Design an enzyme around this catalytic site. Structure first.
Site, short mmCIF file in Angstrom:
data_model
loop_
_atom_site.label_atom_id
_atom_site.label_comp_id
_atom_site.label_asym_id
_atom_site.label_seq_id
_atom_site.Cartn_x
_atom_site.Cartn_y
_atom_site.Cartn_z
N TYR A 3 0.86 -1.18 0.00
CA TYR A 3 0.00 0.00 0.00
C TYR A 3 0.90 1.24 0.00
O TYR A 3 2.00 1.21 0.56
CB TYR A 3 -0.86 0.01 1.26
N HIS A 45 -1.86 1.33 -3.19
CA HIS A 45 -1.89 0.80 -4.54
C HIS A 45 -3.23 1.18 -5.14
O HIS A 45 -4.15 1.59 -4.43
CB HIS A 45 -1.63 -0.72 -4.57
N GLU A 53 -6.01 2.93 -2.57
CA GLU A 53 -6.47 2.54 -1.25
C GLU A 53 -5.29 2.52 -0.29
O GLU A 53 -4.16 2.16 -0.66
CB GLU A 53 -7.21 1.19 -1.28
N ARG A 55 -10.15 1.14 4.98
CA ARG A 55 -9.31 1.86 4.00
C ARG A 55 -9.82 3.26 3.65
O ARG A 55 -11.03 3.50 3.64
CB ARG A 55 -9.27 1.09 2.67
N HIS A 108 -13.88 -3.85 4.84
CA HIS A 108 -14.18 -5.25 4.57
C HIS A 108 -15.21 -5.75 5.59
O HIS A 108 -15.88 -6.76 5.35
CB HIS A 108 -12.92 -6.10 4.67
N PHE A 155 -15.75 -4.78 -0.57
CA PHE A 155 -15.81 -3.63 0.33
C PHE A 155 -17.23 -3.07 0.37
O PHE A 155 -18.01 -3.24 -0.57
CB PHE A 155 -14.92 -2.50 -0.18
N1 2GP Z 1 -12.40 -5.61 -3.69
C1 2GP Z 1 -11.61 -4.88 -4.46
N2 2GP Z 1 -10.34 -5.25 -4.65
C2 2GP Z 1 -9.63 -4.39 -5.43
C3 2GP Z 1 -10.08 -3.24 -6.00
N3 2GP Z 1 -9.06 -2.60 -6.71
C4 2GP Z 1 -8.04 -3.38 -6.55
N4 2GP Z 1 -8.31 -4.49 -5.80
C5 2GP Z 1 -7.41 -5.63 -5.60
O1 2GP Z 1 -7.92 -6.71 -6.42
C6 2GP Z 1 -7.81 -7.95 -5.70
C7 2GP Z 1 -9.21 -8.58 -5.46
O2 2GP Z 1 -10.11 -7.86 -4.62
C8 2GP Z 1 -7.06 -7.63 -4.40
O3 2GP Z 1 -5.65 -7.80 -4.65
C9 2GP Z 1 -7.43 -6.15 -4.20
O4 2GP Z 1 -6.47 -5.38 -3.45
P1 2GP Z 1 -6.63 -5.32 -1.84
O5 2GP Z 1 -6.75 -6.76 -1.47
O6 2GP Z 1 -5.38 -4.66 -1.40
O7 2GP Z 1 -7.83 -4.49 -1.60
C10 2GP Z 1 -11.43 -2.85 -5.82
O8 2GP Z 1 -11.95 -1.87 -6.33
N5 2GP Z 1 -12.15 -3.73 -5.02
#
Ligand code: 2GP
Length: 104
Positions: free
Chosen positions: A38, A40, A58, A77, A92, A100
Site C-alpha cells: 500500500y 496501490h 487505497e 481503508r 471489509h 468492500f
Molecule cells: N475488492 C476490491 N479489490 C480491489 C479493487 N481494486 C483493486 N483491488 C485488488 O484486487 C484484488 C481482489 O479484490 C485484491 O488484490 C485487491 O487489493 P486489496 O486486497 O489490497 O484491496 C477494488 O476496487 N475492489
C-alpha cells in the site's frame, strides 16, 4: 466525533485526514509498505458513487490511531485520488470475500 463508521470502528475527519496525508505522501514518493504494498490502485470493482475523478488509491486507516507502516492493515481503508481528494472511506467489515462496503 464519528464522522465515519466502519463496522465497529469510529473515525473522525482528522483521523481520515491524517491517514490520507500519509498514504498520499508514499504515493508521491513511489513507496509502498506491507505484504499487499500500500498504497496501490483501487479499481472500484464495487462501483461506488465517488464524486472525485480517478485514478483511486487505497490506503489502510487504523483504529488505534497510528499511521500504517507495513504491519497488519486491518479491515478499513481511505481512498484518495491524484489530487489528494478524499474519494471515500471503505471497509471489509460486513462484506463477503475481498469485497468492500462504504463506511457511513
Ligand atoms: N475488492 C476490491 N479489490 C480491489 C479493487 N481494486 C483493486 N483491488 C485488488 O484486487 C484484488 C481482489 O479484490 C485484491 O488484490 C485487491 O487489493 P486489496 O486486497 O489490497 O484491496 C477494488 O476496487 N475492489
Amino acid at each position: 466525533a464519528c464522522d465515519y463508521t466502519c463496522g465497529s470502528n469510529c473515525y473522525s475527519s482528522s483521523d481520515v485526514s491524517t491517514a490520507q496525508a500519509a498514504g498520499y505522501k508514499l504515493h508521491e514518493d513511489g513507496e509502498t509498505v506491507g505484504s499487499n504494498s500500500y498504497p496501490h490502485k483501487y479499481n472500484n470493482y464495487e462501483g461506488f458513487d465517488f464524486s472525485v475523478s480517478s485514478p483511486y488509491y487505497e490506503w489502510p486507516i487504523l483504529s488505534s490511531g497510528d499511521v500504517y507502516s507495513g504491519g497488519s492493515p486491518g479491515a478499513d481503508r481511505v481512498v484518495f485520488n491524484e489530487n489528494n481528494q478524499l474519494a471515500g472511506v471503505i471497509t471489509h467489515q460486513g462484506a463477503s470475500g475481498n469485497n468492500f462496503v462504504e463506511c457511513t
